[PDB]
Design a protein around this ligand. Structure first.
Ligand SMILES: Nc1nc2c(ncn2[C@@H]2O[C@H](COP(=O)(O)OP(=O)(O)NP(=O)(O)O)[C@@H](O)[C@H]2O)c(=O)[nH]1
Ligand SMILES: NS(=O)(=O)c1cccc(S(=O)(=O)c2ccccc2)c1
Ligand SMILES: NS(=O)(=O)c1cccc(S(=O)(=O)c2ccccc2)c1
Ligand SMILES: [Mg+2]
Ligand code: NA
Lengths: 166, 469, 167
């Protein structure tokens, strides 16, 4: 069993915790309890191979912004999450992307761009704009709903595949 | 250079590391042993977070620190003094200018705010995942509410208000799937006819599914508080480990029910059908990764009353002997193949709890509480990490729910199963063994014949599921 | 090659039974243990000049899984029946453990030893004469052990191996 260290990052309130708890427990969290740092573990067969996912759920609130280097050093792949009804959270994506590259001193870090809350009709970030950004990073773009489970396994397991092929 | 720290005389968590207060294992450091002050310092360290440490510590700390004392210590950790103005700051103030306060601002940003946030994260995890400390000590909860509710200052405000709400919700205190669950299957007994439910009249697929839902719920209900300190073996086990004991007693009762179904079927041909049906249930347990259910069957087939029924197993088809033998091989050589299979399957699953219990107990019994170094007694934290590795493995398999529909009547039938009746254990297991001797006497006594007891067809419907539109 | 003996430890829970096998298998001189480690229950020993391998099954902690006892017991060639010298109930349990072993092994003469274990400083309630009388009534050896000083531990296991060899 190979172990994979995944980290979920993005602006406050975009649904990092709801995505993670949906993956771990098949349950949607309605509350908005801002995270400091939580860690989860999941055994799962992906492409016929059993592995062990360690998932670090991180703080999006800006008051925690000086505490990121430590978790970026240890992570092997990053889910970069914004909410498709929050354009500021999409603009915050590039700051996480650049910080990860600086900390890991690498242009080649496994990442997936995630547009969350795709169950909501009132979108403000178009899929095309997010896809253009993902292409510029060389990474896939997956739209998700922590509420309905749409795309959730695809997002996390795509990141596993990119760590595996790294 | 490094930040300067408060004087260790006003703030105890600034004492330098030494072999007299902390020992590391041989890329964050791993702690082998330390004083409680050093453990709490590293639990809330300014340089890095250790989320696995928070879980380990909060699961196991009561073996070395009381809950009331832990709260006092993390409040003491939280209240960090700020440094005085530097010489450059002093000179600016003497000129009527605003000081730059560069060192003060850095100490706030890089020491106080990370440590304080990590203290609050300990509080958040304590309340969310270890709330039993507060259920059992109302005064501890009052102190936590007062501490959280009086944290001032805007940097912590979002988490202070959140933790306050989480506490209030915990005081007065839904699944979505990738697919639809399969259709409930019926055999001789029809929906609502609970009076006819029995081993051969319920559908073997549905027996295995409903027992798996029941055994999964029992597995998922066991909390670490029932395990740490080996409390399920001690005199107060009924008080401290009730969900674990309920889970084990279900397993024992089902095993005994299987045995009773077998040996109370005195006609040989009918008893072969009973054993064959139980092996089919075992096959579905295997398909569902219900390892508790697998071993319930294996335990029954290896019990003294059943294991000796040579005339019965002589008629069991080879393909079913192969299924039972492979399941029994999981337990051989100290569960070697079981451990490998558990770590390879795709959850959901229901682990066998017994191995975890033996490993927690032996880890507790086989390692000292403290290490003595340079005249000091240090808490042996490596021992607690080993226990928490086991409780964490248990928890990892408690997360994933089964995509199976509950059948309320079948669930109730298995919840109310009571093969022992009012009999005591020895009386009942002697009864089962004497029945075994009756139906298949010891050689050279001749094998008797017995009349049939079932008025319905013995043919199994099999264990491959059906799907109408 | 060398003979392997499958030994099984049985007895009441909650009274320090597990210390017997831990102290045997342990790094004798470093008080430390990881039971999850492959073969933390196998030990090569020399008994009366003959080297052998001990495989010890101790399911301590699983006592409430009472319907699994038959299966666990059938794996064994010899048995240590353990009670605590400060717990009279665990001593009174011994008769039924021995009867269950005889039934599972389908023999009236199964290699076994009676072990009285001192697990703490609480007052002894089973005197050595009581346990000697019980062991003699069964025709089996009696060994007393300390859960803290390792005294008696080797004697209990080696005596059982001698019972198997002389069966
Ligand atoms: N409709 C909808 N709401 C969602 C979705 N994901 C999260 N939410 C909601 O958005 C809010 C914030 O979610 P949360 O998971 O706490 O976000 P977060 O990114 O972890 N916040 P933080 O960075 O502070 O820890 C919650 O009310 C949650 O129910 C989604 O996919 N759809
Ligand atoms: N730290 S937490 O509050 O998010 C949490 C609490 C209990 C269990 C889990 S876990 O099952 O995801 C798990 C299991 C084993 C090792 C790591 C994680 C997570
Ligand atoms: N030890 S076990 O759990 O695999 C088991 C128990 C009872 C019966 C069987 S059996 O019917 O497969 C069988 C019968 C006779 C000879 C070989 C095999 C297997
Ligand atoms: Mg969050
Ligand atoms: Na007593």
């Amino acid at each position: 069993m190979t172990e994979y260290k995944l980290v979920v990052v993005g602006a406050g309130g975009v649904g990092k915790s709801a995505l993670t708890i949906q993956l771990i427990q098949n349950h949607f969290v309605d509350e908005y309890d801002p995270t400091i740092e939580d860690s989860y573990r999941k055994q799962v067969v992906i492409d016929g191979e059993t592995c062990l996912l360690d998932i670090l759920d991180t703080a999006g609130q800006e008051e925690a912004s000086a505490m990121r280097d430590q978790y970026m050093r240890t992570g092997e792949g990053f889910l970069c999450v914004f909410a498709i009804n929050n354009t500021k959270s999409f603009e915050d994506i590039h700051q996480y992307r650049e910080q990860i590259k600086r900390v890991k001193d690498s242009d080649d870090v496994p990442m997936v761009l995630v547009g969350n809350k795709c169950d909501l009709a009132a979108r403000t970030v178009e899929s095309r704009q997010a896809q253009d950004l993902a292409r510029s990073y060389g990474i896939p773009y997956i739209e998700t709903s922590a509420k309905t489970r749409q795309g959730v396994e695809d997002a996390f397991y795509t990141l596993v595949r990119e760590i595996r092929q790294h | 250079g490094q930040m300067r720290l408060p004087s260790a005389d006003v703030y105890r968590f600034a004492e330098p590391d030494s072999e007299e207060n902390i020992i590391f294992e041989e890329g964050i450091p791993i702690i082998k042993a330390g004083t409680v002050i050093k453990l709490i310092e590293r639990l809330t360290y300014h340089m890095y977070a250790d989320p696995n440490f928070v879980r380990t510590f909060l699961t196991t700390y009561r073996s070395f620190c009381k809950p009331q004392e832990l709260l006092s210590l993390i409040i003491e950790r939280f209240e960090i003094p700020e440094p005085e103005p530097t010489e450059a700051d002093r000179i600016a103030i003497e000129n009527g200018d605003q000081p730059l306060s560069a060192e003060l601002k850095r100490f706030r940003k890089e020491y106080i705010q990370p440590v304080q946030l990590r203290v609050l994260n300990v509080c958040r995890h304590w309340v969310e995942h270890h709330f039993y400390d507060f259920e059992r000590d109302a005064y501890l909860l009052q102190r936590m509410e007062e501490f959280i509710g009086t944290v001032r200052g805007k940097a912590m405000k979002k988490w202070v208000e959140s933790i306050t709400k989480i506490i209030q919700r915990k005081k007065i205190a839904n699944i979505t799937f990738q697919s639809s669950p399969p259709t409930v299957e019926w055999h001789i007994s029809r929906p609502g006819h609970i009076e006819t439910f029995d081993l051969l009249t319920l559908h073997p697929i549905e027996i295995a599914r409903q027992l798996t839902l029941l055994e999964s719920d029992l597995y998922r209900a066991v909390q670490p508080s029932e395990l740490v300190g080996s409390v399920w073996t001690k005199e107060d086990k009924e008080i401290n480990s009730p969900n674990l004991l309920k889970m084990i007693r279900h397993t024992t009762n089902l095993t005994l029910w299987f045995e009773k179904c077998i040996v109370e079927t005195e006609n040989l041909e009918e008893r072969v059908a009973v054993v064959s049906r139980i092996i089919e249930i075992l096959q579905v347990f295997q398909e569902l990764n219900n390892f508790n259910g697998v071993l319930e069957v294996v335990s029954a087939m290896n019990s003294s009353p059943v294991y000796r029924l040579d005339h019965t197993f002589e008629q069991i088809p080879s393909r079913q002997k192969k299924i039972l033998e492979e399941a029994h091989e999981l337990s051989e050589d100290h569960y070697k193949k079981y451990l490998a299979k558990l770590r390879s399957i795709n959850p959901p699953c229901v682990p066998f709890f017994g191995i975890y219990l033996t490993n927690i107990l032996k880890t507790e019994e086989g390692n000292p509480e403290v290490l003595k170094r340079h005249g000091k007694e240090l808490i042996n934290f490596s021992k607690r990490r080993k226990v928490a590795e086991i409780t964490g493995e248990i928890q990892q398999y408690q997360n994933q729910p089964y995509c199976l529909r509950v059948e309320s009547d079948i669930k109730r039938f298995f919840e109310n199963l009571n093969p022992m009746g009012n009999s005591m254990e020895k009386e009942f297991t002697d009864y089962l063994f004497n029945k075994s001797l009756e139906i298949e006497p010891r050689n050279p006594k001749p094998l008797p014949r017995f009349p049939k007891k079932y008025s319905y067809p013995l043919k199994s419907p099999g264990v491959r599921p059906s799907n109408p539109r």
